[PDB]
Write a protein that binds this ligand. Structure first.
Ligand SMILES: COc1cc(C(=O)NC2CCN(C)CC2)c(F)cc1Nc1ncc2c(n1)N(C1CCCC1)CC(F)(F)C(=O)N2C
Ligand SMILES: [Zn+2]
Length: 293
């Protein structure tokens, strides 16, 4: 059961030429695809229905599309549309030519402070948007934080995302295994927006330190350390940065800042935030010099 060379949406009469294989995001296989008329290039996420035999699995895909289609923001992956034939589900998404923060992290390890500040701000701005629209992502991690040609961050993969339907709703189910998973989820006693602030906590730690805060050889031992709040921040991290991390990584979800407080932290308001980064920043640390020489 093999994937067509040209992807035809019958409703909109659009045709997409399947270009280069980008990789396998879970069930899906992703390709560079291009609209035959405009030649505009997108990421095509193609999932075979042979892996969607169970209603539960179908319901999750429908939910992901439902959530993601409703979203439009500078720091959220553009959802351009979706369609399906008897064999496949096709989702047409904003292409992010510079991959994700995971691949950045693997090249550069710990970032410089102004880089972190730069990316974190964009991460926060997109998450503010999600939260304003009553959406919790629930799996914010480096691999889901994509980068376009100008190194702007775009939040993707809404496969674990959920809608808060009513005020003070505490979700008690999360079908999935988030990476930077919050202690309320692991204890399994209900959760909401603060799950994403925890994840942003871990992301900020990873970006500045060069490894994740609760890492071990065993996933269960890692979950153990999250329960006990067992991490520590290196001495060389500046106290303003360290303090913000500490605020975000509290076991009590009610103690963490909300998403809208974050940009007002000293960390942002009293440090250098570059307006943009050069492409060299994928490979070489920037000195942020005051004039060419
Ligand atoms: C041209 O841009 C991209 C290049 C690569 C890329 O460099 N792929 C290499 C990986 C190694 N193999 C051997 C050769 C191909 C890549 F992995 C991803 C690229 N772009 C990209 N844009 C958007 C998405 C995206 N990748 N992801 C990634 C995540 C895992 C696979 C692609 C797919 C997605 F899910 F559709 C999705 O939602 N989004 C937002
Ligand atoms: Zn399930």
């Amino acid at each position: 059961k093999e994937i067509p060379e040209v992807l035809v949406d019958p409703r909109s009469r659009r045709r997409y030429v399947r270009g280069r294989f980008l990789g396998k995001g879970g069930f899906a296989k992703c390709f560079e695809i291009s609209d035959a008329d405009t030649k505009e290039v997108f990421a095509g996420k193609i999932v075979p229905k042979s892996l969607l035999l169970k209603p539960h699995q179908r319901e999750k895909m429908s939910m992901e599309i439902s959530i993601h289609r409703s979203l439009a923001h500078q720091h959220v992956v553009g959802f351009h549309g979706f369609f399906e034939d008897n064999d496949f589900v096709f989702v047409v998404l904003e292409l992010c030519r510079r991959r994700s923060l995971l691949e950045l992290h693997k090249r550069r390890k710990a970032l410089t402070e102004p880089e972190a500040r730069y990316y974190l701000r964009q991460i926060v701005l997109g998450c503010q948007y999600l939260h304003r629209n009553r959406v919790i992502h629930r799996d914010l991690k480096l691999g889901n934080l994509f980068l376009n040609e100008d190194l702007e961050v775009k939040i993707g993969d809404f496969g674990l995302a959920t809608k808060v339907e009513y005020d003070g709703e505490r979700k008690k189910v999360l079908c999935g295994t988030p990476n930077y998973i919050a202690p309320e989820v692991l204890s399994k006693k209900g959760h909401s927006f603060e799950v994403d602030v925890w994840s942003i906590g871990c992301i900020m730690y990873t970006l500045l330190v060069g490894k994740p805060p609760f890492e071990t050889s065993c996933l269960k031992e890692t979950y153990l350390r999250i329960k006990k709040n067992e991490y520590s921040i290196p001495k060389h991290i500046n106290p303003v940065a360290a303090s913000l991390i500490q605020k975000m990584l509290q076991t009590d979800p009610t103690a963490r800042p909300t998403i809208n407080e974050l940009l007002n932290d000293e960390f942002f308001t009293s440090g250098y935030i570059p307006a943009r980064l050069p492409i060299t920043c994928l490979t070489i640390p920037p000195r942020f010099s005051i004039a060419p020489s």
